[PDB]
Amino acid sequence: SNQLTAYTLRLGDNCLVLSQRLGEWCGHAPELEIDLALANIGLDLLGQARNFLSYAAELAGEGDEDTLAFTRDERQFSNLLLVEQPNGNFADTIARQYFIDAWHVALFTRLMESRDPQLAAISAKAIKEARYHLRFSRGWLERLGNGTDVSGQKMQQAINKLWRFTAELFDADEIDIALSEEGIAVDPRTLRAAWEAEVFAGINEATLNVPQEQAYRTGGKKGLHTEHLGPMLAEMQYLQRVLPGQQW
Amino acid sequence: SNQLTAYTLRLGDNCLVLSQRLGEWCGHAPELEIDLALANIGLDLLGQARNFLSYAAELAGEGDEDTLAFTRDERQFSNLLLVEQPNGNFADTIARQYFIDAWHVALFTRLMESRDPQLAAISAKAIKEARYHLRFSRGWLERLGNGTDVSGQKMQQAINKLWRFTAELFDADEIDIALSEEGIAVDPRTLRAAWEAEVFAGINEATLNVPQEQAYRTGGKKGLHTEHLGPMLAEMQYLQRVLPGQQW
Amino acid sequence: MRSTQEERFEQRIAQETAIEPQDWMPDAYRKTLIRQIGQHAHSEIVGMLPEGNWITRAPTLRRKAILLAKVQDEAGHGLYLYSAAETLGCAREDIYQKMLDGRMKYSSIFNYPTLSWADIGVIGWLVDGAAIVNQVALCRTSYGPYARAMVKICKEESFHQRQGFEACMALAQGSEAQKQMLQDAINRFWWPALMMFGPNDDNSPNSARSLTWKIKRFTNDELRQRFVDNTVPQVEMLGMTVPDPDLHFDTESGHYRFGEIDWQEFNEVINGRGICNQERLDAKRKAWEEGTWVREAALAHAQK
Amino acid sequence: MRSTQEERFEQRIAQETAIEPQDWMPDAYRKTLIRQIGQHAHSEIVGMLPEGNWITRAPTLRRKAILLAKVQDEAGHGLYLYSAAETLGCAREDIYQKMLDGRMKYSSIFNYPTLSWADIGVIGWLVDGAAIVNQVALCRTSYGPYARAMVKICKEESFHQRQGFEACMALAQGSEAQKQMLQDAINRFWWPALMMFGPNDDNSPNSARSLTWKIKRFTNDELRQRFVDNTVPQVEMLGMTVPDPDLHFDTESGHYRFGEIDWQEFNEVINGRGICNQERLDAKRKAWEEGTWVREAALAHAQK
Ligand SMILES: C[C@H](O)CC(=O)SCCNC(=O)CCNC(=O)[C@H](O)C(C)(C)COP(=O)(O)OP(=O)(O)OC[C@H]1O[C@@H](n2cnc3c(N)ncnc32)[C@H](O)[C@@H]1OP(=O)(O)O
Ligand SMILES: C[C@H](O)CC(=O)SCCNC(=O)CCNC(=O)[C@H](O)C(C)(C)COP(=O)(O)OP(=O)(O)OC[C@H]1O[C@@H](n2cnc3c(N)ncnc32)[C@H](O)[C@@H]1OP(=O)(O)O
């Protein structure tokens, strides 16, 4: 149960934290249409976070999505390092979104075959949304990569800047492996082929290069984060920290 | 006593909030010498905040500088709107610093003649530091304003962007007036001549223009802030909010 | 003598025949609608900013999700209004630029800061409540594309306004600190919400023609009175007060009589000198300028 | 046969006659000191970033002020070390650029993230404690400008290290949550602090010459052993533990024997592949590039 709880929480945390980053874009996008699109994606991801976190609380036998989101510190958060990266320019945001949506598609496709019914059901809802997200992010990868000289350069740089964090997408620990052998979780190492098939093709189509740097950054799943997470949590949790134990 | 407490708290809050902004620059300056200088100024201002806040707590008969800094929300904070402005580029930071140091010099010069001994003593320490700050900020105003075309433009824009908040430097309310008639506080309206003599000359010397926009923004002293303060307080207070009532 | 075109138009208006984009219309009618629908669409866009200010800080995931859905809808509504304005021969890109330059207005209410989470529920409740009274009144505006866009918009907005009220109800029934938060948000937003309806009927240069052309179906003062009569019972349901010493029920007239609006403040705000005017326009100008390479990328990709 | 210049130099070193900037020195001696003093100065600069990360979040105004004073001192120490390095004929601007390009190193310890306030007290205590052992050992380094800069630096640093320990003592004597914070910070910083002393005496390419030229007065392992012997009693004073199952007192030798360092991690880190390497250099590169117009302004003003 402890393993299943932690696994579920990781997936919830990935979506929660990325949703937070997308929320910062509200009113700041290059076009009203993009503002609409980012709010929509952030809303889907928030919905997924609520689903995973709710199940995590139910598994643990205490708390709820709000105790989980607002009363854990950065050392207890278990999101991927990729989703806590700063928004940066629009290409930095597109790169991060594309890497994640490609992964979500690969993951949720297989997780809807989980032998855990609730995880399977949550995943069956999330995959429909992840497919929308991937069309949007891949569409923008192509438009920026194969746009102007300027946009092509920014998109390459965005990709290069984020690459080292992709290692964690296929990192497996004992929780992953144990649950995967029970047919409950997906072993993230087995997601590489599908993610690379999508992402390599997408970058190529955009007229860009796959970075040659070997990806090496992990630790988010173990509560070992970059220096970006603490400040995100200060902002996210402030009100709950000031006025704890209330209804809103 | 209530008026004196609020007046003292305003001065403390001005220094605390500006100190917070300067702290963000640490490690990010254009030169190691500038990093040194900004940390130094931020440290002086923090020292002043501790002095004013400590006296404010003593006047109120409860709490201390930490209860004041970490347990008040944005509607209770009484700093000038000018000191909560974002750092922006280096000129934005220099403009904000220069406007404030010129004001501090004018104010503390007169406040060391306060009929309140503790306010007079706090002011006698602060004026020595404010004089250092003014040399630094005015020096950089001149170097940027009368540097390159590029730096000259950025410095003008920085000045223009901040101008509307200077109205609050000479805004007097019933607390100001009542305490000033007792010879305890300085009536901020009477600071205009000295501040304008300094600032008008400095801008001219830098080969820049005094903005023609009539300054119109106030409210910080009444706890009516820009949307910048809330996020600053979330960052500043997080740990204290998470782990209240402890010793550090 | 009116021309036959002019006379026919007045007859169409009198018989409540909706004006469509291909119909003749007085040039002053075309222009006042480009003005009003364009500034209505500008308001949707700017209004995302005070609410967006709290998306990352909302106290529960439920309230955060509700707020994201609202803001996403506002964006969609801006799009509907730009489409409607474009049927009159204007260009979205052009009127948006006039907004950036301060050559066109957006709603006064969006120049006020969100200083607490309660402000968000109060915007959902009072501010959206005022927009609903005004916007439902426009479902019978004389220009068809505008009327039909109002129908669609009003169907969506009133749901969000109900959610705003429920967020305020949570504070009203919560701890003493939450109740004080709500009251303070009301104290700061009450009068600005009243100002959303526009100037008095004595000081409203566009009303003469707008009323005659059935663009405006109720006077600014009429709509504001209805809002006060409808909203005061909602304030009471929350156990809250209105920051108006002169508010009272007048049994003689069957209305709540309320105090004088600060028109000096109103005029400062609509002319760029309110609390957040500079910040709102800086933010949209920054988004436009920094997004330029993105728009140029999309254009260059389309062509290939 | 050594040349007379070479022989005279070896005789100066043996008699502990400080080498000064105008003295002949082997070219390899000049260069290893430009390397070591330059990277020492780089370390001062980069080390401002993990601590700066917490200046705006420190839990009390007292702890915030102490931390600001420390960081201000670090900047000053960087300046002293650049001055000292420049006496050897190098240019600060040039070696700083090599640091930005990853062509020169800075201390491994600064590639680790500050994930809690306890990390700050632990950096003040363990990390500064390790730098003090190493830096006091360099007060008798053979090159005069370097030795004298170490004297000045050590006089200032040991005060800040004492303040770091006191911040850790507050957590150690505080609530259960504060105690757990301290332990977790120790668990994450203990081994990285041990690595500050450098590789084992068997794997240290610069040691042969540095020891012979009395640049290095104690071996990496000797200094690390002294640090462990001195620090373990401080950990005990805090009522804390060391994340080392093999640490034990050996009465036979009179030393604490401790476990094996992860040299694979060490080598990853010093070669740019640690936890924060990319972030640290991005931050300094960003500061340099974005500050360019400021430096060009100062230069153009000076000339007028
Ligand atoms: C996104 C939000 O939900 C949008 C809303 O629904 S807010 C609720 C009010 N509704 C709207 O703003 C949209 C539809 N517009 C209207 O109904 C009308 O334009 C109105 C009632 C706001 C003003 O009436 P109108 O006859 O156009 O102007 P008038 O009464 O003569 O006012 C004089 C000037 O002040 C402007 N004004 C009036 N009230 C204003 C306000 N609250 N904010 C900003 N400007 C205002 C008018 O547009 C006009 O200036 P202009 O000629 O440069 O446009
Ligand atoms: C700002 C901080 O307070 C600075 C500190 O005081 S930290 C404490 C350690 N002291 C210093 O870093 C400053 C003075 N320097 C030294 O004493 C020595 O350079 C040292 C002990 C770090 C390394 O010994 P040295 O003989 O120079 O190198 P060696 O033992 O052969 O190590 C092999 C390589 O790894 C580097 N290295 C060793 N330890 C390192 C570490 N902890 N971090 C980064 N690089 C390290 C060496 O510089 C060398 O590489 P290079 O030839 O490219 O410079």
**Residue C209: which residues within 8 A CB-CB, separation 6 or more?**
C28, C29, C32, C215
Name D24's Cβ contacts closer than 8 Å, sequence gap at least 6. Answer: D5, D8, D9
- Residue with token string 């931020």: B42
* Nearest Cβ partner for B227 among C114, C184, C268: C114
The bridge status of strand D255-257 relative to strand C248-250 is unpaired
Calculate how far, in angstroms, residue C71's C-alpha sits from the geometric centre of ligand 1: 21
B248 by DSSP, 3-state: which? coil
Q: Which residues of B touch A241 (CB under 8 A)?
A: 238, 241-242
**How many Cβ atoms are within 10 Å of C122's Cβ, its own excluded?**
30
**Phi, psi dihedral angles at D249 (to 5 degrees):** -80, 135
Tokens representing A145 are 């990569």
Burial A201-221 (b: 16+ CB within 10 A, else e): ebbeebebeebeeebbbbebb
CA distance D273 to C245: 67
Which residues of chain A are within 8 Å of residue C42 when distances are taken between CB atoms? none
Query: Using CB atoms, which chains have 3+ pairs under 8 A with A?
Result: B, C, D
Instruction: Specify burial of residue B36 (Cβ count, 10 A radius: 0-12, 13-18, 19+).
Output: buried
Q: How far apart are CA C186 and CA C183, in angstroms?
A: 5
Hey, is the C-beta of A212 within 8 angstroms of any chain C C-beta?
A: no
User: What are the CA-CA distances from residue A140 to residues A37, A45, B63, C72 (Å)?
Assistant: 12, 19, 54, 20
Contact B81, B228 (CB under 8 A): no
Method used experimentally:
X-ray
Whether residue D68 contacts residue D45, with contact meaning beta carbons closer than 8 Å, is answered with no
Q: How far apart are CA C166 and CA B38, in angstroms?
A: 47
Cα D294-D300-D303 angle, rounded to 5 deg: 145
Task: State which amino acid sits at residue A169.
Answer: L
Distance of CA C169 to the CA centre of its chain: 23
- Best mutation site among C29, C31, C39 for ligand 1 pocket (most ligand atoms within 8 Å of CB): C39
Residue pair D121/D171 in contact (Cβ under 8 Å)? The answer is: yes
Beta bridge partners of residue D248, listed in sequence order: D257
Contact list in B for residue D76 (CB cut-off 8 A) is 36
CA angle (B171 as vertex; B165, B172 as ends), nearest 5: 160
Q: How far apart are CA D128 and CA D105, in angstroms?
A: 19
Angle at B146 between CA B154 and CA B126, to 5 degrees: 80
SS3 labels along chain D: CCCHHHHHHHHHHHCCCCECCCCCCCHHHHHHHHHHHHHHHHHHHHCHHHHHCCHHHCCCHHHHHHHHHHHHHHHHHHHHHHHHHHCCCCCHHHHHHHHHCCCCCCCHHHHCCCCCHHHHHHHHHHHHHHHHHHHHCCCCCCEHHHHHHHHHHHHHHHHHHHHHHHHHHHHHCCCHHHHHHHHHHHHHHHHHHHHCCCCCHHHCCCHHHHHHCCCCCCCHHHHHHHHHHHHHHHHHHCCCCCCCCCCEEECCCCEEECCCCCHHHHHHHHCCCCCCHHHHHHHHHHHHHHCHHHHHHHHHHHHC
Nearest CA to ligand 2 atom 3: D131
Select from B164, B224, B234 the Cβ nearest to the Cβ of C278.
B164
C18: its two tokens: 């909706």
Ligand 2 atom nearest residue D77's Cα: 1
Angstrom distance (rounded) from CA D205 to CA B48: 51
CB D43 near ligand 2, within 6 Å: yes
Structure tokens at C258: 């309320």
Q: Do chains A and C touch (3 or more CB pairs under 8 A)?
A: yes
Question: What burial class does residue B203 get, using C-beta atoms within 10 Å of its C-beta: 0-12 exposed, 13-18 middle, 19+ buried?
Answer: buried
Tokens of A179: 């649950």
Contact C172, C63 (CB under 8 A): no
| Chain D residues closer than 8 Å to A74 by CB | 115-116
Q: At what angle do helices C176-195 and C220-237 cross, to 10 degrees?
A: 170
D145 C-beta closer than 6 A to ligand 2: no
Residues in binding site of D: 35, 39, 105-108, 134, 195, 204-206, 216, 220
Residue type, C50: P
Distances from the Cα of C194 to the Cα of C159, C167, C242, angstroms: 21, 21, 12
- B227 to C184: CB separation less than 8 angstroms, yes or no: no
In Å, what is the CA distance from B39 to each residue of B36, B56, B80, B125? 5, 25, 21, 18
Element (H, E) at B145: helix B117-145
Q: Is B177 annotated as a binding residue?
A: yes
Cα B31 to Cα B47: distance, rounded to the nearest angstrom: 24
How far is A65 from A56, CA to CA, in rounded Å?
Answer: 8
Q: Answer whether C294 sits within 8 Å of A151, measured CB to CB.
A: yes
How many domains, in total, are found in chain C? Answer: 1
Radius of gyration over alpha carbons of chain D, in Å? 20
Burial of residue A148 (number of CB atoms within 10 Å: 0-12, 13-18, 19+): middle
Q: Which residues contact C281 (CB under 8 A, 6 or more apart)?
A: C100, C102, C272
> Domain limits at A185?
1-248
Residue type, B215: A
First CA to last CA across chain B, in angstroms? 30
Q: Are C116 and C185 in contact (CB under 8 A)?
A: yes
C165, C171, C301: best mutation site toward chain A, by most A Cβ within 10 Å?
C301
Contact yes or no for D88/D30 (Cβ under 8 A): yes
Nearest-neighbour CA in chain A from D276: distance (Å): 7
Asked if C78 and C99 count as a contact pair (C-beta separation under 8 A), the reply is no
Angle between helices D61-86 and D27-46 (to 10 degrees): 160
CB atoms within 10 A of CB C108: 21
- Cα–Cα distance between A159 and A95 in angstroms, integer? 6
What is the distance between the alpha carbons of residues B156 and B213, in angstroms, rounded to a whole number? 13
Three-class SS of chain A: CHHHHHHHHHHHHHHHHHHHHHHCCCCCCCCHHHHHHHHHHHHHHHHHHHHHHHHHHHHHCCCCHHHHHHHCCCCCCCCCHHHHCCCCCHHHHHHHHHHHHHHHHHHHHHHCCCCCHHHHHHHHHHHHHHHHHHHHHHHHHHHHHCCCHHHHHHHHHHHHHHHHHHHHHHCCCHHHHHHHHCCCCCCHHHHHHHHHHHHHHHHHHCCCCCCCCCCCCCCHHHCCCCCCHHHHHHHHHHHHHHCCCCCC
Q: Which residues of A touch C288 (CB under 8 A)?
A: 30
Helices A117-145 & A32-60 angle (0-180, nearest 10)? 160
Whether A175 has a binding-site annotation, put simply, is no
Residues near C36 by Cβ (< 8 Å), separated by ≥ 6? C206, C210, C215
Give how far the C-alpha of residue D215 lies from the chain's centroid of Cα atoms, to the nearest Å.
Answer: 16
Question: How would you write chain C as a 3-class SS string?
Answer: CCCHHHHHHHHHHHCCCCECCCCCCCHHHHHHHHHHHHHHHHHHHHCHHHHHCCHHHCCCHHHHHHHHHHHHHHHHHHHHHHHHHHCCCCCHHHHHHHHHCCCCCCCHHHHCCCCCHHHHHHHHHHHHHHHHHHHHCCCCCCEHHHHHHHHHHHHHHHHHHHHHHHHHHHHHCCCHHHHHHHHHHHHHHHHHHHHCCCCCHHHCCCHHHHHHCCCCCCCHHHHHHHHHHHHHHHHHHCCCCCCCCCCEEECCCCEEECCCCCHHHHHHHHCCCCCCHHHHHHHHHHHHHHCHHHHHHHHHHHHC
Of D55, D102, C26, which Cα lies nearest the Cα of B38? Answer: D55
Is the minimum CB–CB distance between A75 and chain D shorter than 8 Å?
yes
What whole-number distance in Å separates Cα of residue B139 and Cα of residue B141? 6
Give the DSSP per-residue string, B185-224.
Answer: S--GGGGHHHHHHHHHHHHHHTT-----SPP----GGGT-
CA-to-CA distance for C149 and C78, rounded, in angstroms? 10
Chain length of chain B: 248
- Please identify which residue in the block is written with the tokens 């802030």: B225
Geometric angle at alpha carbon B192, from B187 and B193, rounded to 5°: 120
Type of residue numbered D113: P
How far does C20 lie from chain A, in Å, by closest CA?
26
User: What residues in D contact B65, CB-CB < 8 Å?
Assistant: 61
Radius of gyration of chain B (CA): 18
Structure tokens belonging to residue A185: 């979780």
Overall number of domains in chain B: 1
User: Could you identify the residue written with the tokens 């349901």?
Assistant: C237
Residue in C closest to B73 by C-alpha: C116
Q: Does D99 contact ligand 2 (Cβ within 6 A)? A: no
- CA angle, residues B205, B206, B207, in degrees to nearest 5: 85
Domain that holds residue D261: 1-304
| C-alpha neighbours within 13 Å on the C-beta side of residue D9 | 21
| CA-wise closest residue to B204 among B135, B162, B146, B130 | B146
The resolution in angstroms reads 2.0
The rounded Å distance from CA D99 to ligand 2 centre is 14
Neighbours of D34 (CB within 10 A): 18
Asked if B36 contacts D75 with a C-beta cutoff of 8 angstroms, the reply is yes
Q: Positive or negative CA dihedral for B146, B147, B148, B151?
A: negative
Q: Provide the CATH number for the domain around residue D70.
A: 1.20.1260.10
Q: Is D36 in the pocket of ligand 2 (CB under 6 A)?
A: yes
CA B49, CA A49: separation in Å to the nearest integer?
Answer: 42
Atom of ligand 2 nearest to the CA of D107: 43
| CB contact set of A239 (below 8 Å; sequence gap of 6+) | C57, C58, C59, C117
Q: How far is CA C258 from the centre of its chain?
A: 22
Q: Phi-psi bin for D214: left (phi > 0), alpha (psi -120 to 50), beta?
A: left
Q: Which residues of D210-238 are buried (b: 16+ CB within 10 A; e: fewer)?
A: beebbbbbbbbbebbbbbbeebbeebeeb
CB-CB under 8 Å, C276 with B227:
yes
D36 CA to centre of ligand 2 in angstroms:
7
CB atoms within 10 A of CB C246: 9
Contacts of B197 (CB under 8 A, 6+ apart): none
- How many CB atoms lie under 10 A from the CB of residue C103? 9
Task: Specify binding-site residues of D for substrate.
Answer: 35, 39, 105-108, 134, 195, 204-206, 216, 220
Integer Cα distance of B21 and D52 in angstroms: 12
CA proximity to D165, closest of D237, D229, D102, D106: D237
C-beta atoms of C115 and B234 within 8 A: no
**CA-to-CA distance for A196 and A163, rounded, in angstroms?**
12
Backbone CA torsion sign across A17, A23, A28, A33: positive
Q: How far apart are CA C38 and CA C198, in angstroms?
A: 16
D249 within 8 A of D236, measured Cβ to Cβ: no
For A186, other C-beta atoms within 10 Å of its C-beta total 23
Which residue type sits at A167?
A: A
Q: In chain B, helix, strand, coil percent, each to 5?
A: 70, 0, 30
Which amino acid belongs to residue C270?
I
Three-state SS letters, B12-56: HHHHHHHHHHHHCCCCCCCCHHHHHHHHHHHHHHHHHHHHHHHHH
Question: DSSP character for B87?
Answer: -
CATH of the domain at A23: 1.20.1260.10
Looking at residue C282, its amino acid is D
Taking phi over 0 as left and psi of -120 to 50 as alpha, with beta for the rest, A245 belongs to left
What whole-number distance in Å separates Cα of residue D130 and Cα of residue D132?
Answer: 5
The set of protein residues with a Cβ atom below 6 angstroms from ligand 1 is C 35-36, 39-40, 43-44, 47, 105, 107-108, 130-131, 134-135, 195-199, 204-207, 210, 216, 220, 270
